[PDB]
């Protein structure tokens, strides 16, 4: 057992190969599958796992009612092997949680589970399933974290948490965690910026996060930092806007794009010098479709020109949250950190006539060999028996 | 593989961080979940498991009828990983049992399962799943034990069993067990005391148990002993009465408090010199709510003053049994024995209009970092389809 | 990994401690549990397992219809951990089989599964799941074997199979198997005797089997042999008759007792010099009740006097097959081979108004510490939804 | 952990002993069993697994509707232990796929999953569950592969893929794969031949495949090749025609037999010098029955004389696909590669009046000990509740 190094670069990729699809909603029409949202994938040096927030209820049972609601004492962070449906019979218990993160440092799993009331929530940190630290809300307004993997470099793992308003300026903290103990945190000086639900990855010993501006930005904010939590900030400049909702593509900005800026969706992007791989919905107004776009000057340039598009989910199909995950050299035998991504395919409320809301998932890994666009959608036929 | 030392002291703690929640009754509305009661948690040097007594039946199935009944030949002691629902598809069989204890000595699991008739019950002891001893009823009146983990120090494990009436003086025995063999037993000289369902923990090579007085005490009796089973006895002095039912808080006693003293509920407390952490129900009269209370002179002092109260379950929510469990240094890497506790959230009879009685659970570990009070209730909507 | 020695004596025992109960039928009212019959228990140097013949169907589903039928192409030998319900989600596949045996030599599992037509069935032998030998019917009349564990001594495993009429003289062969290969077999000279469904155990390097005389004996036949398959034969002499059906207890015989001799039930007994532990039904005419009797001169003496009786299942409750299993010193750390037993608790046809027949199980291990008689019955309320 | 040598010859065999049967459709009537088709078996040096293509849906649930359809975005390659039903609670996820292959090289599993559109499908190759390559459609017309195990020799694994029309000349490529990376590929010069759904096995360091001619052959084509992918081609000469449909047996041909030659079924055969073991349907016109036939000159001779026939599934029972699988010496301890085979038992559309199509399986291993013919059919009673 050895710490992941996290010191190689991101592998450059030409397209995305499908890695997993779980068909959870399809299978939960009959089988015992958790009602879930906020899924994400994270890997150890030996296997990849799907992490997700349960509702403490199964699909197609009465306790699925009301599950549009984000935060309750019943929600738990749990994990199963990638591509398997999340069921009480295959799922490992991680933490009591209505907001979460997790990541493996090479030696053990770190899990971060936020529960408690909206005015003073507490994140419980676990290393190898043992409680190792806690951190309490510091603005008393829904302490919340990534809903995707935290990032590890040389035995330290890093995450971002936000506390405060979700329709205005909030507070954003970056954390360095070692064996599940917070060893350093910094509060970001970021006036007129808004960060939430960061998708963070390691690249050459430093962390880059792409996040959700729920306040006033239809492009995505980014923060990058070193092991000492010295950070830089910015927004993705590309006029290929990454949030949902958003405007039609036009000239972008290196600040927040106010047009259609309020509200948002968790997502991700990968930086490659001045270029960017952008994952986004296909709809500008709802969580429908998904596509990957390579924009070779999109990190720093404001034009709406891009070089490559790869379809993932079709425009008339439900999508949802998306996030980054990596596969480190210790897992693959490669010489670079491999970028991958997952998409949550949300079914039910508020868009469909059900009592419940739940998602399934798809994921892909970046390759340089041949790939193809298609649509891999959820596939479930709603409503269900219980509706 | 090495014996747990058990020679460090209990970690002083300032608050309780939430560790697990299984949502078993919400899930068993559709999934295949055992009807259970009397769960408890116990840990090895590698993992924590939930142990429970099934009723040989699944929730929402006709065999769950009459599960108010305590003792039958169908009841079995099983276990699963902490925070998962108890299902036949994830559950390890331990013993045939309608009363039980279990604990791991660092090398293997000890399990204690009592079955057979009320007038001649037999505890079957197993080590690593092999039967290694038996002990038979010596008062022919419901031989019964902790319904929580036994306690181990340096290769020896310890438990308490009771035999006799449950509305008067009974007989209380203390056992030393090594590799599943009873190596010593003593009968307590405790006239006017009553002890059952003891919650016992190791602390500086010695055992402390905090039990239930079902005869005439609304404070909790305690017994502590060394490896030779030389023991001392008393009741918790605090005016913050620990049993349910009980009177409102007032001046306490260092012997049994007869007011509201008949009947009771399994519980626990942790001793820290002259102070005490008390877990108890929030209602004085029924199994509702739960809270933890730090009384810095409550072990030996009789006033009803205390310094910390942390909410766990809201007063209008169903409560039940509670018990201690520890995490040893061999598991955590800490220099002290970490105290944790679980709470059984009972649903169904006699308080609700169902044909069945079954419980879910929640657990908490002691920490010194920030924590928050809240309510983490069972969450199921009764009645169920079978009712 | 080392061969079981099989050279110590059977442990002398004063009574029987309950080891397992699975509540299969109760649990299969809702959950996914196999329809099964002919269960049995067998242990490796590390765990004990329940082996059973499925009907290729689950309880409370329509394909359970007609499962009174013994032999079909759908029946499979499968195994799960002891005390767990046999479910498609916890059961390991062993062999296609409508008659079976299994046993662990200390290194790997041997399994023996008979399938094919009644006029030319074939036993498929597997060692660690790999086909290692076959043997075909030699009388073309339902080749059949123990329906309980084979017995191992110093790397060789032994079993008995029968072929021919079930209401008359048939043929009986004994086999020595090494790494799943038959290395020697002999056909017994046993005129006027009948052997099937043998319960065989090792004791001081030799094998003793107690079997079912379906032709004309209400006491049990026995055959014992050394590693060379040199054998001795006889019937249990005790007037405490062991089969079902049988007469009421009277003077026994060392030959087959013809009174109520026809038909039978698989059973077991353990020899201790001139004495015998007899397991049997409590009813003389149907498979109801179960009891363990120590008769100190019952192996060779014909009187109906015994010294000890221990109730297991009460007279008005369904029972069924029973068999021996052992726990070798390599598993327990004892200096003797420990005797144990299981009882199948048959539910459904032909005695009850259902479409199906299935069993659950209980088992016990022999001890010298205190024990108690009771009744641990199946517990299921028939008929079921499907009926 | 060591690479499978693959340098020994195939074990000559005299008959087929039954190895597994899952009863999946019978079990799926109540249990949580995937709708599947195109199952196959493949073994490592430690265990044998069944691989299968799910339809992303369970039996007896509405999502099973329309599962006659071959290719969708929901279909996934998963695996479970041989003889267990494929359930989401015992199934390992492998790949997103509507056509697949898998094999173990002695160190890790290679999996090949083709998904995406008919005009541009991509095979995703994984080694130990990590994506290691991709190959994309080169004729834009349903890239498709074996639906059975690939074959490995000394650390290289080999498969066959087809792209083009399924009613005319297509293009056929052979691949060498090492640690999941394509290291060589060749396109076959095979005018007037057609190959798909190849059953390929190793034998004396070389690969033999027997395939399906869907264009104009009612005998089966074959291709054999060495590690450098230098190949030879031919059709099986026997007048015992192996495809389905086919004409009645008569004088065969060493090229494609046009009579009844369009259409087909996946199958297999084993070469032993100039002789062949042929598995085929018993019906000449639909997928009914199964039998094995040893024709000692059938590889190269055109007569319809043969010497052994062993019944496997009766002529009035549904059969389907069949394929080879091997057990290497590293798994068995033998001095030769053991031949085995599986048969897919298809139920539902198009032959039965259901909304769904799904398969169970049986499997057999070659032996030289005694064996028997019989029928081991699927056994389910259609229609189901969902129909
Ligand atoms: C899905 O859930 C909604 C919301 O219900 C609320 O949350 C649930 C999980 C439960 O804890 C409910 O107890 C809780 O009400 C269900 O709508 C609700 O239905 C109930 C009874 O069917 C309504 O009860 C009424 O309440 C009013 C007071 O406002 C009384 O005057 C009435 O006499 C009656 O008691 C309840 O009002 C209603 N809640 C809302 C917000 O409309 C809904 O039925 C459920 N759907 C299914 C399929 O279960
Ligand atoms: C199987 O699928 C068919 C085709 O989609 C279903 O039939 C359709 O049902 C929808 C829902 O009401 C109707 O709007 C269409 O008129 C139907 N089309 C046809 C051709 O019938 C059918 O209900 C499905 N069966 C199940 C069990 O889901
Ligand atoms: C707390 C504010 C935040 C942004 C609006 O709400 C999130 C939005 C969500 C959404 O936009 O789908 C779902 C998240 N589960 C929720 N997070 C929490 C912690 O409740
Ligand atoms: C036997 C007396 C005892 C105290 C009154 O009953 C206990 C009370 C219980 C209770 O108060 O909820 C549940 C326990 N399962 C039961 N124990 C047994 C062995 O049945
Ligand atoms: C084959 C004769 C034998 C004795 C009558 O039948 C057995 C009796 C049985 C019984 O008495 O319950 C059930 C067994 N499963 C059956 N064995 C076989 C192989 O079918
Ligand atoms: C694509 C042509 C091919 C031959 C007609 O179809 C196959 C026939 C099938 C069949 O004859 O049963 C089922 C296979 N799953 C299908 N393969 C794919 C990739 O769809
Ligand atoms: C990265 O870290 C590894 C492990 O410490 C080290 O061997 C190597 O020299 C470092 N950097 C690169 C880019 O290879
Ligand atoms: C990684 O951390 C270890 C332990 O703190 C330290 O010795 C080492 O210098 C670190 N490596 C780098 C490249 O910072
Ligand atoms: C605890 O016991 C261990 C036994 O290995 C011993 O080494 C040590 O002296 C003791 N520790 C404390 C904290 O007293
Ligand atoms: C249900 O339980 C009651 C006792 O509460 C019992 O006496 C009654 O007979 C039971 N009903 C069934 C159907 O088992
Ligand atoms: C613990 O037990 C061992 C073996 O019985 C003994 O040698 C040792 O002295 C004990 N340690 C203490 C601290 O009592
Ligand atoms: C059971 O099988 C019998 C015999 O085939 C049949 O006649 C009967 O209707 C079936 N019953 C049920 C409930 O399926
Ligand atoms: C055990 O078996 C081996 C043969 O494998 C033999 O050499 C050895 O002597 C045997 N022991 C006895 C006591 O028979
Ligand atoms: C097997 O492959 C290894 C590594 O390529 C090589 O050393 C060896 O010569 C090969 N064996 C044969 C028989 O070709
Ligand atoms: Ca926004
Ligand atoms: Ca651009
Ligand atoms: Ca009391
Ligand atoms: Ca006080
Ligand atoms: Ca008889
Ligand atoms: Ca006698
Ligand atoms: Ca053809
Ligand atoms: Ca021929």
Author numbering:
A (entry chain C), B (entry chain B), C (entry chain A), D (entry chain D): 82 to 468
Question: What does the original paper state about this entry?
Answer:
NA is a homotetrameric transmembrane glycoprotein responsible for cleavage of sialic acid from the host cell membrane. By blocking NA enzymatic activity, neuraminidase inhibitors (NAIs) prevent new viral particles from being released from the surface of an infected cell, thus stopping the spread of virus in the airways. In this study, we applied a set of experimental techniques using recombinant NA variants to understand the molecular basis of development of oseltamivir resistance in the viral N1 neuraminidase NA2009. To decipher the structural mechanism of resistance, we determined crystal structures of NA2009 mutants in complex with oseltamivir carboxylate.
In the H275Y/S247N variant, the water-mediated contact with the oxygen atom between the N247 side-chain and pentyloxy substituent of oseltamivir seen in S247N NA2009 does not form due to the change in position of the pentyloxy substituent caused by the H275Y substitution. The dramatic effect of the H275Y/S247N double mutation on susceptibility to oseltamivir (8-fold and 500-fold increase in Ki compared to the H275Y and S247N single mutants, respectively) can thus be attributed to the combined influence of the change in oseltamivir pose and alterations in the hydration shell structure. Most of the mutated NAs retained Km values almost identical to that of wild-type, while the S247N/H275Y double mutation resulted in a three-fold decrease in substrate-binding ability. The catalytic efficiencies of the H275Y, I223V/H275Y, and S247N/ H275Y variants were 4–6% of the wt value, illustrating the significant effect of the H275Y mutation on the enzyme’s catalytic activity.
